Design a protein around this nucleic acid. Structure first.
Lengths: 102, 98, 675, 48, 70, 48, 91
RNA sequence: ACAAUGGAUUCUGGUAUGUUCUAGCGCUUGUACUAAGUCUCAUGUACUAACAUCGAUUGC
């Protein structure tokens, strides 16, 4: 049991997004360079604007999905426990935090 | 029952004078801004355009944050030539303010 | 670990130090053992600074060397936590390691008291019945003694307004309040806790116990009843002091007479010698054991009351955070604590004297003696203990030896622990206030005879009852080499020369008692009187308490606090100031601090603005009404040679100076002396 | 893991924390036994 | 709130970029301007014939609280 | 000149170098106009 | 004048101790009219503390109480720490 | 046969503190009726002093 370290958590997050990129290519397949300017020193990479848009969309979708999966957790945990005496929400979140200690 | 109501009111109030005074002051400031904004909207309906006043400088080197990007730290220069990205971001920003 | 987790762990550091000051064990369930080890390392580190700052600042307050007014309240608040932490630790060492009295000691201690009271034919004090002829007068004397606290002060808190109401309910219903006390003595055995506080005295810190008011009435009734019924049944013999019949200056006067009255003490034609012993009994009340105490009180008291007294001592002692159960020691703040304390001292008085001599001093049961009287002179000549008296925890023994009885006594001491380098005169403590001629001469024969006297007396009392130590011992031997007999009674420092031991008989001033024999009616000794050094600092600390408590107090309250403390000095030590040069420098420096307080209320300490007319004119004429004791020429005489002998008054130092000369009177001319 | 700090003295946010989170194991030795037994045996000898 | 612990101390990084004032302090006045360089009556009675690392448990602490309380 | 640079025009410096206020001051003006030792020790030297 | 403890004053005292801890009783007794800070401190330590056990004694605890009351006669605050009971329960 | 003589005064003291007080334009769109001021005394109220208050004797 126990917790998962950050180097093991990062690999599992990297393994998970590779399966999201695998099925994204499978759902697409189901439906149907390097230039180095010598004067400036800058390196320009030419890439597809669709794959850059799909990168920007999927990060926003994962940002909203974790935002909504946490918002429902806020609305559920506020309306679970009311037995022990509280005063405000920061007291409830602290007295619940004492319960996970024991 | 009266002393129980008083004890119930006392146990459920945890703030203090300075915190409560600060809450009242913040509410007053928010109401003052909303009133001034409404006053400007009603005068804009009458054609007269009056600008929003700035909060006066409390000290000599006080900072207007809207006028200037403040202690700007530029992103370190990189080998990837972000030139067209800046054009698209400028176009989208000017589109937003339009 | 982030700024959040570093923020929460530092609250276990603050909580641990509050548990340390409370003497509460800090144990957090689930705390990691490396991190608990870190906090205890730094709480002990902070405690080493906190305790050492309490030791350093205490030594500054005693010297008077510029302590801030806040720090005096802070050093008081530190030591009372250190005293209770030392008190609570001492309680746990008895609870772990058992009682300090062994079963062999407590059997013999109990057997000595049964043997004594059987010879006295002592009838024990009964429980006070419903038909008791003195019950309404004992109750009024209790309530008037509780009421005398509150005639002085003006405003009362919620506890004190409760206390006056419970007396007024007892004045109006005298029969109903007796039935309440009679029920509390039969039944009540668990009592409300006691809030302790500590009074600052700038040299020491005295404890004060606060008992609940409803429980204080049944203690004050019991203390009147125990003390009235003991004197009727004659429990306490003549040596136990305070006597209820003589003031503490008269206790010095009779004891100094009653030495000289007894025969052949000053006769030193043979090798005969006289020894006077002074020892405090250490932690006498602190070492009272409750199981021995409840068993001892059943001898003299009906066991319903003997169970009340034992259970009343077993209560909770509360400071602010600190709280503990008094398992072992006696509480001196209770009302009947004085009856316990002298009865426990009577047990110690029978261990030193023994059964045979304590009958000789107290006399027979039917016709007992006076304080220092024997039924005949042959009873006196036997058993070299001549005069015994005991104050609170300070005993006073007079031993008159022959030369043969003296050499036997001092040989068996040197048999047990001799000295080859002759070092018994090093730790021998005598009076550094008297000159070197006048104090005890450190003769090898008399010093070893003095330590042999103390060695015999220390062995008679076990260390489980009282801690009788040589550093608290003062022994003065009178011999052919020592013409002086020195002792210290109730704050009075006394020196005695016989009439024949003087070189020439010179006339003396008020500081000298002339000691008369009863049958010749002739003055045959002179008693030389001085105030103790411990009492001089005690008065110097009272002047500090007048100034340090007065923040912005009016001018005439400072003058009235000066007067009530200068009168309490001079009316007690009447004729003893005159021989003391340190006290006269205290009186001058003390009175000019009171005058400077009036000069600090204004913004000028300039001498011309403040004549003696401002301070010393009476309040009816508009002045402060200050009583002076310091417009007096102070005797200054050759400090290099004043330590050697008594020079006499050869020169006068000026006492208080003023531009226009006024001879302000002093109350020593207005208070008639004790002799 | 560090437990949270609940103090008996200080409550800055004013949280209502349950009574068990806010707030010996030995016996007496034989010295207190042998003291009391000898005092009774000295007392019963004294009564007889 | 308003009574806080420190999360970090004030650094000398901030005072280094400021402009100086040049105000004359009394303890910065010249002093020590030259350095030094190295080259039968007994029978009747009843009873007849070291350092601890703890400031509170210390022997001096017991002698302290016995004399200063009394 | 120094008094008037500090804005303390409600303090009048006499020709005999006596420094007195010209009105009843506010507590904020008493905080501002509280000159130190080096002003007054200089001013008393000029009075001497 | 000394009042008795009703059930409303007990539950205010429980909620105040749960709010203020046990080392400030003049702040607990300010919620309760007619109770002093000493009275509310003592009511907690004798009756309302959940650490205290108001249970019947076992057959061993009865014989162990009779054993202590001869060892320590009669020292009921000391016996109550041995018994880990309140002292008025032990008497 | 004694000539012996220290001082000394300034500063830090319940309304503190805080806010707002655009007259003088920045180009384009959009003949509706008469009580003064200062000083002094008295009374009433509010705030305030982090002012003070119990020292002692009796005719049933």
């Amino acid at each position: 049991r126990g917790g998962i370290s950050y180097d093991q958590l990062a690999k599992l997050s990297y393994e998970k997004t590779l399966r999201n990129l695998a099925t994204q290519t499978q759902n697409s397949s189901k439906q149907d360079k390097v230039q180095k300017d010598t004067k400036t020193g800058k390196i320009t990479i030419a890439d597809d604007d669709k794959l850059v848009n799909k990168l920007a969309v999927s990060l926003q979708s994962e940002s909203k999905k974790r935002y909504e999966a946490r918002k429902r957790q806020m609305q559920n945990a506020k309306t679970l426990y009311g037995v022990e005496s509280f005063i405000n929400d920061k007291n409830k979140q602290f007295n619940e935090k004492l319960s996970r200690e024991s | 029952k009266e002393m129980l109501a008083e004890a119930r009111a006392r146990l459920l109030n945890t703030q203090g004078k300075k915190a409560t005074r600060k809450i009242r002051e913040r509410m007053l400031e928010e109401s003052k801004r909303i009133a001034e904004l409404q006053k400007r909207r009603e005068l804009k309906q009458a054609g007269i355009n009056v600008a929003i006043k700035k909060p006066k400088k409390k000290y000599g080197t006080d900072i207007d944050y809207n006028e200037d990007i403040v202690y700007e730290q530029a992103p370190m220069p990189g080998i990837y030539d972000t030139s067209t990205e800046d054009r698209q971001i400028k176009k989208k920003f000017e589109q937003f303010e339009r | 670990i982030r700024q959040k987790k570093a923020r929460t762990i530092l609250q276990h550091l603050s909580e641990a130090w509050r548990c340390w000051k409370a003497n509460i064990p800090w144990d957090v369930p689930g705390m990691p053992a490396p991190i608990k080890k870190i906090i205890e390392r730094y709480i002990k580190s902070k405690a080493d600074a906190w305790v050492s700052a309490a030791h350093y600042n205490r030594e500054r307050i005693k010297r008077g060397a510029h302590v801030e007014k806040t720090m005096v309240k802070k050093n008081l608040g530190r030591l009372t936590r250190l005293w209770i932490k030392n008190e609570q630790e001492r309680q746990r060492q008895i609870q772990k390691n058992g009682p300090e009295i062994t079963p062999e000691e407590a059997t013999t201690i109990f057997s000595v008291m049964v043997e004594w009271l059987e010879s006295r034919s002592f009838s024990p004090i009964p429980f006070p019945p419903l038909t008791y002829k003195n019950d309404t007068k004992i109750l009024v004397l209790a309530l008037e003694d509780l009421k005398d606290v509150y005639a002085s002060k003006v405003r009362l808190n919620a506890s004190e307004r409760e206390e006056l109401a419970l007396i007024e309910e007892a004045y109006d219903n005298p029969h109903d309040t007796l039935n309440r006390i009679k029920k509390y003595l039969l039944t009540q055995r668990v009592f409300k806790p006691v809030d302790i506080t500590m009074m600052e005295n700038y040299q020491n810190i005295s404890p004060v116990y606060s008992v609940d008011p409803l429980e204080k009435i049944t203690d004050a009734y019991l203390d009147q009843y125990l003390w009235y019924e003991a004197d009727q049944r004659k429990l306490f013999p003549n040596w136990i002091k305070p006597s209820d019949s003589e003031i503490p200056p008269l206790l010095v006067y009779k004891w100094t007479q009653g030495i000289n009255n007894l025969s052949e003490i000053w006769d030193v034609s043979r090798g005969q010698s006289a020894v006077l012993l002074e020892t405090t009994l250490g932690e006498m009340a602190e070492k009272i054991d409750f199981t021995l105490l409840n068993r001892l009180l059943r001898l003299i008291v009906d066991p319903n009351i003997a169970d009340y007294i034992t259970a009343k001592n077993n209560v909770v002692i509360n400071f602010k955070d600190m709280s503990h159960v008094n398992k072992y020691g006696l509480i001196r703040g209770l009302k009947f604590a004085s009856f316990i304390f002298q009865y426990y001292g009577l047990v110690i008085d029978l261990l030193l004297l023994g059964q045979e001599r304590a009958t000789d001093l107290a006399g027979p049961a039917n016709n007992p003696n006076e304080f220092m009287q024997f039924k005949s002179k042959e009873v006196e000549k036997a058993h070299p203990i001549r005069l015994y008296t005991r104050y609170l925890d300070r005993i006073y023994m007079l031993f008159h030896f022959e030369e043969d009885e003296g050499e036997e006594l001092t040989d068996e001491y040197l048999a047990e622990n001799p000295d080859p380098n002759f070092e018994n005169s090093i730790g021998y403590n005598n009076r550094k206030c008297w000159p070197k001629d006048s104090r005890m001469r450190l003769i090898r024969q008399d010093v070893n005879l003095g330590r042999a006297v103390f060695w015999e007396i220390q062995s008679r009392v076990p260390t489980s009852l009282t801690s009788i130590k040589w550093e608290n011992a003062f022994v003065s031997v009178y011999s052919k080499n020592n013409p002086n007999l020195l002792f210290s009674m109730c704050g009075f420092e006394v020196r005695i020369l016989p009439r024949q031991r003087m070189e020439e008989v010179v006339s003396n001033d008020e500081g000298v008692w002339d000691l008369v024999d009863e049958r010749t009616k002739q003055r045959t000794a002179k008693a030389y009187l001085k105030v103790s050094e411990e009492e001089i600092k005690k008065f110097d600390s009272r002047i500090r308490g007048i100034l340090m408590a007065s923040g912005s107090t009016t001018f005439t309250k400072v003058a009235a606090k000066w007067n009530t403390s200068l009168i309490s000095l001079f009316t007690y030590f009447r004729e003893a100031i005159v021989a003391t040069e340190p006290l006269l420098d205290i009186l001058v420096k003390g009175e000019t601090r009171i005058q400077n307080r009036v000069k600090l209320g204004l913004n000028s300490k300039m001498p011309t603005r403040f004549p003696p007319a401002v301070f010393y004119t009476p309040k009816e004429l508009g002045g402060l009404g200050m009583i002076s004791a310091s417009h007096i020429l102070i005797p200054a005489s050759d400090l290099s040679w004043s330590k050697q002998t008594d020079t006499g008054i050869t020169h006068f130092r000026a006492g208080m100076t003023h531009e226009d000369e006024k001879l302000i009177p002093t109350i020593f001319r207005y208070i008639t002396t004790w002799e | 893991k560090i437990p949270a700090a609940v103090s008996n003295w200080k409550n800055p946010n004013g949280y209502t924390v349950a009574l068990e989170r806010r707030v010996e194991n030995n016996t007496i030795n034989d010295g207190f036994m042998k003291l009391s037994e000898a005092l009774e045996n000295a007392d019963k000898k004294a009564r007889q | 709130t308003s009574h806080r612990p420190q999360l970090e101390a004030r650094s000398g990084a901030k005072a280094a970029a400021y402009t100086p004032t040049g105000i004359e302090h009394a303890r910065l006045l010249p002093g020590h301007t030259t350095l030094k360089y190295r080259k039968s009556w007994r029978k009747g009675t009843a009873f007849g014939r070291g350092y601890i690392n703890d400031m509170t448990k210390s022997e001096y602490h017991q002698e302290f609280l016995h004399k200063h309380v009394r | 000149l120094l008094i008037h640079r500090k804005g303390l025009t409600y303090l009048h410096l006499d020709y005999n170098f006596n420094l007195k206020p010209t009105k009843t001051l506010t507590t904020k003006e008493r905080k501002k106009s509280r000159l130190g030792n080096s002003f007054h020790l200089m001013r008393e030297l000029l009075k001497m | 004048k000394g009042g008795v403890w009703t059930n409303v004053e007990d539950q205010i005292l429980k909620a105040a101790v749960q709010k203020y801890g046990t080392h400030q009783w003049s702040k607990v007794a300010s919620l309760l009219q007619k109770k002093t800070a000493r009275q509310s401190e003592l009511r907690w330590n004798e009756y309302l503390n959940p650490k205290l056990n108001f249970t019947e004694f076992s057959k061993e605890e009865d014989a162990q109480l009779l054993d202590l009351a001869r060892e320590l006669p009669n020292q009921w605050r000391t016996i109550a720490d041995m018994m880990a009971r309140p002292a008025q329960v032990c008497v």
